[PDB]
C-alpha cells in the first residue's frame, strides 16, 4: 500500500507545511492596511486621470487626416 | 388547396421510448435493495449495545 502512498506524500507535505509556514510567517497587517487603503484609490484614480485627460487632445487632431 | 406539411418525423419504438424516458421503476426498486444487509446491520449494533 505505502508505495502507492508515495505519490500522496509530496502533495500532502508540500500543502500542509506550506500553510503552516505561511500562517506562522506573515501575520495580519489590517490597521496599516487602513492607512494604505485610501491612498490606494487616490493614486489609482489620479494616475489614471493623467491619461483620462491627455486623451482629449488627440481625438479631434485625428480629424486632420481621418475626419473628412 | 394544401395544408402545411410537418415533414418527416420519427416514430420511436415503444421499447426505445421507454429506454429514453422511463418513474415508478425506482419507487419499486428502492425496497428491493434492503435485504442484502438485514442480518449484519441489526447484529452489529445489538452486540455493541450488549457491550457498550
Amino acid at each position: 500500500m505505502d508505495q502507492v502512498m508515495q505519490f500522496v506524500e509530496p502533495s500532502r507535505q508540500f500543502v500542509k507545511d506550506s500553510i503552516r509556514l505561511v500562517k506562522r510567517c506573515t501575520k495580519p497587517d489590517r490597521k496599516e492596511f487602513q492607512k494604505i487603503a485610501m491612498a490606494t484609490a487616490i493614486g489609482f484614480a489620479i494616475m489614471g486621470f493623467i491619461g483620462f485627460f491627455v486623451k482629449l487632445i488627440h481625438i479631434p487632431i485625428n480629424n486632420i487626416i481621418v475626419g473628412g | 388547396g394544401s395544408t402545411s406539411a410537418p415533414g418527416q418525423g420519427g416514430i420511436l419504438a415503444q421499447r426505445e421510448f421507454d429506454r429514453r424516458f422511463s418513474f415508478l421503476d425506482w419507487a419499486a426498486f428502492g425496497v428491493m435493495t434492503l435485504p442484502s444487509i438485514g442480518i449484519p446491520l441489526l447484529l452489529w449494533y445489538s452486540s455493541k449495545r450488549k457491550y457498550d
Binding site: 485627460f53 482629449l56 487632445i57 481625438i59 479631434p60 485625428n62 480629424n63 481621418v66 475626419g67 473628412g68 | -
Partner: protein, 121 residues
C-alpha cells in the same frame, strides 16, 4: 473650504461650461458627424463646418481643453517665479507653462481656422 479649493471647482466648472455642455444636453448632437466618400463609404467628421452656431459633443471638450491649458499656463509661470524653488525646476516651469501658453493658443486658432474656411481670410 479654502479659497484654492473653491477656485479649483470654478476652473473645473469653466471647463465643462465653456465646452458647451448645456448645448449638448438640450440639443444633443453626436460627438462627430460622418460624410460620404466618393466611393460611397462614410468618413466621420469631427467639426460641423460653416455652422458657427453648432457643435458636436467632443468638439467642445477639445476646445475647452485647449482653453484650460492656456489659462493654467500663466498660473504655472507665476508659480515658477518663486525664489525657493531649485533652479533646475525653475527653468522647467518656465518651459512647461510657456509651451502650454503657446501651443494651446496656436492649436485653438488652427481649430477655428478649421471650423470657418474663410476665417481671417
Amino acid at each position: 473650504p479654502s479659497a484654492m479649493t473653491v477656485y479649483a471647482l470654478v476652473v473645473v466648472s469653466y471647463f465643462l461650461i465653456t465646452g458647451g455642455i448645456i448645448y449638448d444636453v438640450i440639443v444633443e448632437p453626436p460627438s462627430v458627424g460622418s460624410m460620404t466618400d466618393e466611393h460611397g463609404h462614410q468618413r466621420p467628421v469631427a467639426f460641423l463646418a460653416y455652422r458657427v452656431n453648432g457643435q458636436y459633443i467632443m468638439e467642445g471638450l477639445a476646445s475647452s481643453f485647449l482653453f484650460t491649458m492656456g489659462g493654467l499656463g500663466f498660473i504655472i509661470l507665476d508659480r515658477s517665479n518663486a525664489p525657493n524653488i531649485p533652479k533646475l525646476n525653475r527653468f522647467l516651469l518656465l518651459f512647461i507653462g510657456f509651451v502650454c501658453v503657446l501651443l494651446s493658443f496656436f492649436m485653438a486658432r488652427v481649430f477655428m481656422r478649421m471650423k470657418l474656411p474663410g476665417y481671417l481670410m
